[PDB]
Design a protein around this ligand. Structure first.
Ligand SMILES: *[C@@H]1O[C@H](CO)[C@@H](O)[C@H](O)[C@H]1NC(C)=O
Lengths: 43, 49
């Protein structure tokens, strides 16, 4: 007593590259130096 | 008790050369900003030991 579909395949990832976008940051920088004064040698 | 600024500063190159050829630093920092030079000493009124 003697005695399989075929096709075309496209595979896809889950994508992991996190989304970039630029951001504008507005801010001010106040700096306070302080000094002493005697003769000609500022401390 | 009042404030406490503390700033971290690079020595001058002549001093770098001193440091690593003698194992010692000078007890004074000096930096010029705008016109005049400014200067700090270790304990107050100290010299440049
Ligand atoms: C301390 O001494 C060094 C060399 O002896 C000198 O270059 C420096 O200007 C001095 N700092 C002072 C006098 O404040």
């Amino acid at each position: 007593t003697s005695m399989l579909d075929e096709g075309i395949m496209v595979v896809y990832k889950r994508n992991i590259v996190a989304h970039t976008f630029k951001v504008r940051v507005y801010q001010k920088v106040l700096t306070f130096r302080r000094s002493y004064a005697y003769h000609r040698t500022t401390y | 008790l009042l404030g406490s600024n503390t700033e971290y500063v690079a020595p001058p190159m002549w001093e770098i050369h001193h440091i690593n050829s003698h194992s010692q630093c000078y007890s004074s920092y000096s930096r010029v900003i705008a016109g005049t030079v400014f200067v700090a000493y270790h304990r107050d009124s100290y010299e440049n030991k």
